[PDB]
Amino acid sequence: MKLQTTYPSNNYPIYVEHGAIKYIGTYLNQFDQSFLLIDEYVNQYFANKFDDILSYENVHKVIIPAGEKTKTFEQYQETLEYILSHHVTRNTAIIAVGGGATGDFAGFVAATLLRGVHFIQVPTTILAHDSSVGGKVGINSKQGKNLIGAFYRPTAVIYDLDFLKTLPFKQILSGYAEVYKHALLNGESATQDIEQHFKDREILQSLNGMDKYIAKGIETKLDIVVADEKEQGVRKFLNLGHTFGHAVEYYHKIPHGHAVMVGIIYQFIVANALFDSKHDISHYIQYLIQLGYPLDMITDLDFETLYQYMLSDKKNDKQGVQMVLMRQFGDIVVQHVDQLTLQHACEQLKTY
């Protein structure tokens, strides 16, 4: 399945197939050079996977830190300086091969190399069905996740759906949180429909019918990003449950999806607190348990530290904290949420 961003100028493809890993080479030699940034663990896993195209005269393998441990200022310099020492050109390409983390990083590298070079997204996780589309790249700060980065359109995205066969459950759950989020955004139908298909752990864990809920996720985003690339309003909707989520992920150091799920239920808690959309909290809470989500850190949360982090959030203004709330499937709204709600929603979410 091939897709394409419908922007005015410079648009990119997105190959979502079970052999998409082949679509790499139709580019490699049309670039003076190519630098393959690959996660340190992904590199072990798929040792020869990328020899068919790496044993070339242009391609060089660059091994960065595993996941979120690469998204730092320090690594940014090293990797860039290392790269440049190869007398590159403005027509070089950066091939990201790994999770969302190696993707954000390689992307921020590519986006700033000689003021911008070529970028090829090659996701290998479920969560990266999300992170590889939209052009958002970057690293982390001492203040929070993704606080330095940029909007840079990749030349093309290549999502080989065969990489899911090696994903551990902890990452299925993690990636599933984004597949589920796009669903919540797709309406009461798509939610209860995906909730109906992926009923419990064993279903998810098996991954049957996943190939479908991913393509549906990618599409759903491709729409919000083409329609509002610079997050000038609507794209703020992909941030569903990330306000609290990003705070739990950074401070509690738990997987992105896991935090997002917890960020989701908390968001409903607020949508009650304010609009009183009367959300079935007991429903969502349970559905997560079945799927197999941990929920052990729920008790170790801490409104105080999370709140201060929540002030770094990229959606706020001078007025204070800001969240993406759901009032009804098809009625998502963004707005201020003073410490009040955040004081009694982190405690009502503790009720569980």
Binding residues vs ligand CRB (CB under 6 A)? 130, 134, 136, 145-146, 178, 231, 235, 238-239, 242, 314
Q: Which of 256, 258, 272, 279 is catalytic?
A: 256
Distance in angstroms (rounded) separating the CA atoms of residues 120 and 201: 33
Cα 158 to Cα 40, 120, 178: the distances in Å are 20, 7, 18
Would the annotation count 342 as a binding residue? no
- Closer residue to ligand CRB in complex, CB, 92/155: 155
Is there a catalytic annotation at residue 256?
yes
Is there a catalytic annotation at residue 136?
yes
Closest distance of CB 333 from ligand CRB, Å: 16
Distance in angstroms (rounded) separating the CA atoms of residues 157 and 112: 19
Is there a catalytic annotation at residue 231?
yes
Give the three-state DSSP class for 126: coil
Would the annotation count 104 as a binding residue? yes
Would the annotation count 124 as a binding residue? yes
Would the annotation count 25 as a binding residue? no
Please state, as a whole number, how many other Cβ atoms lie within 10 Å of the Cβ of residue 62.
16
Closest distance of CB 315 from ligand CRB, Å: 8
- Closer residue to ligand CRB in complex, CB, 179/269: 179
Q: How far from the centroid of its chain's Cα atoms is residue 197's Cα?
A: 23
Is there a catalytic annotation at residue 142?
no
- Closer residue to ligand CRB in complex, CB, 49/235: 235
Q: Which of 140, 146, 239, 272 is catalytic?
A: 239
Is there a catalytic annotation at residue 242?
yes
Q: Which tokens belong to 49?
A: 């996977």
Is there a catalytic annotation at residue 61?
no
**Rounded CA Rg of the chain:** 20
Please state the φ and ψ torsions of residue 33, each to the nearest 5 degrees: -160, 165
Q: At a CB cut-off of 8 Å and minimum separation 6, what does 180 contact? A: 191, 194, 261, 264
Q: Which of 118, 153, 182, 242 is catalytic?
A: 242
Would the annotation count 256 as a binding residue? yes
Q: Which of 129, 153, 182, 235 is catalytic?
A: 235
Spell 116-154 as b/e; 16+ CB within 10 A means b.
ebbbbbbbbbbbbbbbbbbbbbbbbeeebbbeebeebbb
Could you give the residue ranges of the DSSP H alpha helices within the chain? 25-28, 42-45, 73-84, 100-112, 128-131, 169-186, 188-197, 201-206, 210-227, 242-252, 256-273, 281-291, 303-309, 339-348
Is there a catalytic annotation at residue 278?
no
Would the annotation count 70 as a binding residue? yes
Closest distance of CB 344 from ligand CRB, Å: 24
- Closer residue to ligand CRB in complex, CB, 65/217: 217
Q: Which residues does the annotation place in the binding site for NAD(+)? A: 39, 45, 68-71, 100-104, 124-125, 136, 145, 163-166
Q: Which residues does the annotation place in the binding site? A: 39, 45, 68-71, 100-104, 124-125, 136, 145, 163-166, 178, 242, 256
Q: Which residues does the annotation place in the binding site for Zn(2+)? A: 178, 242, 256
Positions marked catalytic: 115, 136, 178, 221, 231, 235, 239, 242, 246, 256
